[PDB]
Design an enzyme around this catalytic site. Structure first.
Site, mmCIF file in Angstrom:
data_model
loop_
_atom_site.group_PDB
_atom_site.id
_atom_site.type_symbol
_atom_site.label_atom_id
_atom_site.label_comp_id
_atom_site.label_asym_id
_atom_site.label_seq_id
_atom_site.Cartn_x
_atom_site.Cartn_y
_atom_site.Cartn_z
ATOM 1 N N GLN A 19 0.841 -1.195 0.000
ATOM 2 C CA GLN A 19 0.000 0.000 0.000
ATOM 3 C C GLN A 19 0.879 1.249 0.000
ATOM 4 O O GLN A 19 1.473 1.615 0.996
ATOM 5 C CB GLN A 19 -0.973 0.052 1.166
ATOM 6 C CG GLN A 19 -1.899 1.246 0.954
ATOM 7 C CD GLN A 19 -2.788 1.542 2.109
ATOM 8 O OE1 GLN A 19 -2.319 1.849 3.221
ATOM 9 N NE2 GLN A 19 -4.094 1.526 1.877
ATOM 10 N N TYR B 113 -6.234 10.943 3.355
ATOM 11 C CA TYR B 113 -4.822 11.174 3.032
ATOM 12 C C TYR B 113 -4.689 12.006 1.768
ATOM 13 O O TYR B 113 -5.626 12.631 1.318
ATOM 14 C CB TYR B 113 -4.064 9.846 3.116
ATOM 15 C CG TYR B 113 -4.128 9.293 4.524
ATOM 16 C CD1 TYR B 113 -3.564 9.979 5.593
ATOM 17 C CD2 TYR B 113 -4.752 8.082 4.783
ATOM 18 C CE1 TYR B 113 -3.613 9.492 6.877
ATOM 19 C CE2 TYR B 113 -4.803 7.580 6.059
ATOM 20 C CZ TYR B 113 -4.251 8.265 7.121
ATOM 21 O OH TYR B 113 -4.343 7.733 8.367
ATOM 22 N N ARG C 169 -7.436 2.229 -3.310
ATOM 23 C CA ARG C 169 -8.347 2.297 -2.181
ATOM 24 C C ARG C 169 -8.993 3.678 -2.123
ATOM 25 O O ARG C 169 -8.309 4.700 -2.187
ATOM 26 C CB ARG C 169 -7.622 1.998 -0.871
ATOM 27 C CG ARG C 169 -8.597 1.520 0.200
ATOM 28 C CD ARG C 169 -7.929 1.019 1.462
ATOM 29 N NE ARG C 169 -8.846 0.136 2.172
ATOM 30 C CZ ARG C 169 -8.822 -0.185 3.456
ATOM 31 N NH1 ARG C 169 -8.071 0.440 4.310
ATOM 32 N NH2 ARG C 169 -9.654 -1.137 3.891
HETATM 33 C C1 LIG Z 1 -4.496 -0.808 13.592
HETATM 34 C C2 LIG Z 1 -5.119 -0.303 12.313
HETATM 35 C C3 LIG Z 1 -4.287 0.330 11.359
HETATM 36 C C4 LIG Z 1 -4.759 0.715 10.128
HETATM 37 N N1 LIG Z 1 -3.879 1.322 9.192
HETATM 38 C C5 LIG Z 1 -4.328 1.440 7.878
HETATM 39 C C6 LIG Z 1 -3.420 1.627 6.838
HETATM 40 O O1 LIG Z 1 -2.166 1.618 6.956
HETATM 41 N N2 LIG Z 1 -3.967 1.830 5.582
HETATM 42 C C7 LIG Z 1 -5.329 1.747 5.330
HETATM 43 O O2 LIG Z 1 -5.724 1.946 4.150
HETATM 44 N N3 LIG Z 1 -6.174 1.462 6.314
HETATM 45 C C8 LIG Z 1 -5.685 1.264 7.544
HETATM 46 N N4 LIG Z 1 -6.584 0.865 8.515
HETATM 47 C C9 LIG Z 1 -7.982 0.588 8.172
HETATM 48 C C10 LIG Z 1 -8.259 -0.899 7.887
HETATM 49 O O3 LIG Z 1 -7.647 -1.301 6.673
HETATM 50 C C11 LIG Z 1 -9.738 -1.197 7.739
HETATM 51 O O4 LIG Z 1 -10.294 -0.580 6.588
HETATM 52 C C12 LIG Z 1 -10.599 -0.835 8.963
HETATM 53 O O5 LIG Z 1 -9.990 -1.247 10.176
HETATM 54 C C13 LIG Z 1 -12.025 -1.335 8.838
HETATM 55 O O6 LIG Z 1 -12.075 -2.770 8.771
HETATM 56 P P1 LIG Z 1 -12.422 -3.618 10.102
HETATM 57 O O7 LIG Z 1 -13.707 -3.060 10.672
HETATM 58 O O8 LIG Z 1 -12.546 -5.028 9.581
HETATM 59 O O9 LIG Z 1 -11.256 -3.435 11.041
HETATM 60 C C14 LIG Z 1 -6.103 0.516 9.794
HETATM 61 C C15 LIG Z 1 -6.934 -0.075 10.749
HETATM 62 C C16 LIG Z 1 -6.434 -0.479 12.004
HETATM 63 C C17 LIG Z 1 -7.388 -1.176 12.952
HETATM 64 C C1 LIG Z 2 -4.170 2.708 21.637
HETATM 65 C C2 LIG Z 2 -4.574 2.369 20.207
HETATM 66 C C3 LIG Z 2 -5.302 3.613 19.667
HETATM 67 C C4 LIG Z 2 -6.215 3.221 18.503
HETATM 68 C C5 LIG Z 2 -6.924 4.454 17.935
HETATM 69 C C6 LIG Z 2 -6.353 4.716 16.546
HETATM 70 C C7 LIG Z 2 -5.680 6.015 16.221
HETATM 71 C C8 LIG Z 2 -5.529 6.284 14.726
HETATM 72 O O1 LIG Z 2 -5.033 5.204 13.972
HETATM 73 C C9 LIG Z 2 -4.742 5.505 12.635
HETATM 74 O O2 LIG Z 2 -5.957 5.275 11.846
HETATM 75 C C10 LIG Z 2 -5.863 5.670 10.491
HETATM 76 C C11 LIG Z 2 -7.206 5.550 9.818
HETATM 77 O O3 LIG Z 2 -8.039 6.504 10.453
HETATM 78 C C12 LIG Z 2 -4.818 4.764 9.851
HETATM 79 O O4 LIG Z 2 -4.634 5.070 8.510
HETATM 80 C C13 LIG Z 2 -3.460 4.851 10.563
HETATM 81 O O5 LIG Z 2 -2.661 3.840 10.017
HETATM 82 C C14 LIG Z 2 -3.701 4.597 12.060
HETATM 83 O O6 LIG Z 2 -2.453 4.764 12.697
#
Ligand SMILES: Cc1cc2nc3c(=O)[nH]c(=O)nc-3n(C[C@H](O)[C@H](O)[C@H](O)COP(=O)(O)O)c2cc1C
Ligand SMILES: CCCCCCCCO[C@@H]1O[C@H](CO)[C@@H](O)[C@H](O)[C@H]1O
Length: 364
Positions: A99, A185, A232
């Site tokens: 990504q 972003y 995405r």
């Molecule tokens: C810890 C964490 C980090 C994430 N970092 C990114 C990321 O690097 N790029 C992205 O497009 N989405 C990121 N997301 C969003 C996930 O790809 C996903 O779309 C989102 O968590 C919703 O799916 P879920 O409900 O199955 O978790 C992140 C989500 C979480 C929970």
């Molecule tokens: C202690 C853990 C805190 C979890 C709350 C998440 C704070 C934000 O989390 C961010 O969410 C973004 C999407 O909104 C992602 O793109 C980033 O990768 C992620 O770092």
């Protein structure tokens, strides 16, 4: 779950099932240098029963980074760190896309060498935080900074950085790339009307707001081929500060634009954290007509809703984010109805192997 466990063709690839591990920033990259590493390779390989893995966002340049300790894809060492990941994943029989990330204004100077963030405009993302390295081992949450508006030359530079990052991903052994044009972003800061107050050819009209996306995608496709490029989008979530006034029009148009480029998949981020807007089925069906490649959705899916989305003709693949953190064997669990472990928020970001590679597989 029957359809979920059907294979699917993705370009030149045959994937094992319809389950995606979507991008999940873990902020585990080695320091100094933001280098993908051994614990990450194990982590991804543990999850390689997915049909497709999409890496966590990986910044295309020093000023593309939003969060402490995320892995880059622009130095030789970073490429090599990713190669160990892709080797590990491929040894398991799995496809993996990188990504490619530019956060634009969703950052803090501390993460970008003291530089001011860039965006379409000078609009700060409202009610948004990122995290920085404060010298401690836990992320330090901070308000984002006010960006400067990109010039034409900045646009050219970022396009060049994306293009090169795609080549770097191929050198690292990825099967493809995913352009992060979602979740507030940089590219999303151009797409969404309320984030873009440009008066040049990159803002106002719908055509203009889609232009940066168009040009970035064109460069990615030219570099590595459309069959290796996914994108995405986040039509309706607004958590990170991007709002569009007419998202059905904007995002149907974006889908049709991407269809023209013949990108191999379109990935819709339907939920971001707790931001779970109503996403009408009529709109999903419009996206399905506008874009006729592989359609991936992620956000609050479980086995039932994933199967239903595929059988209703809305999606071809479904990503599971949070459940994949805590369930390395998520596909097996979904197939059998084994209970899912839940993840620990405190170990999502930063640290080491704990809360990364030590979630067990299911054992009755
Ligand atoms: C810890 C964490 C980090 C994430 N970092 C990114 C990321 O690097 N790029 C992205 O497009 N989405 C990121 N997301 C969003 C996930 O790809 C996903 O779309 C989102 O968590 C919703 O799916 P879920 O409900 O199955 O978790 C992140 C989500 C979480 C929970
Ligand atoms: C202690 C853990 C805190 C979890 C709350 C998440 C704070 C934000 O989390 C961010 O969410 C973004 C999407 O909104 C992602 O793109 C980033 O990768 C992620 O770092």
């Amino acid at each position: 779950x029957q359809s979920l466990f059907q294979p699917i063709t993705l370009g030149a690839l045959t994937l094992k099932n319809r389950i995606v591990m979507p991008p999940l920033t873990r902020s585990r990259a080695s320091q100094p240098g933001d280098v993908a590493n051994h614990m990450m390779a194990i982590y991804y390989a543990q999850r390689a029963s997915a049909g497709l893995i999409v890496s966590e966002g990986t910044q295309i340049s020093p000023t593309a980074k939003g969060y402490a300790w995320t892995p880059g894809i622009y130095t030789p060492e970073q490429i090599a760190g990713w190669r160990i990941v892709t080797e590990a994943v491929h040894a398991k029989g799995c496809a993996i896309f990188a990504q490619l990330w530019h956060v634009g204004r969703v950052t803090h100077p501390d993460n970008i060498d003291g530089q001011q963030p860039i965006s379409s405009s000078t609009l700060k993302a409202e009610n948004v935080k990122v995290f920085v390295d404060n010298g401690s081992d836990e992320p330090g949450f901070v308000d984002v900074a006010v960006p400067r508006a990109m010039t034409k030359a900045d646009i050219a530079q970022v396009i060049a950085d994306y293009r090169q990052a795609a080549l770097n991903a191929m050198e690292a052994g990825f099967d493809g790339i995913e352009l992060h044009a979602a979740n507030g972003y940089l590219i999303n800061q151009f797409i969404d009307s309320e984030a873009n107050n440009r008066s040049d050819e990159y803002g106002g009209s719908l055509e203009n707001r889609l232009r940066f996306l168009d040009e970035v995608v064109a460069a990615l496709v030219d570099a590595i081929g459309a069959e290796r490029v996914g994108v995405r989008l986040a039509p309706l979530t607004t958590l990170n500060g991007t709002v569009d006034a007419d998202p059905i029009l904007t995002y149907t148009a974006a889908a049709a634009l991407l269809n023209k480029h013949r990108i191999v998949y379109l990935h819709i981020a339907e939920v971001d954290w707790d931001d779970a807007p109503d996403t009408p089925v009529s709109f999903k069906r419009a996206l399905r007509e506008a874009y006729q490649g592989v359609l991936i959705y992620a956000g609050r899916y479980n086995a039932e809703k994933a199967e239903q989305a595929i059988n209703d003709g809305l999606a071809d693949m479904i990503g599971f984010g949070r459940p994949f953190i805590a369930n390395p064997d998520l596909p097996e669990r979904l197939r059998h109805g084994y209970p899912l472990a839940e993840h620990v928020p405190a170990t999502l970001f930063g640290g080491g192997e704990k809360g990364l590679t030590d979630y067990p597989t299911y054992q009755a």
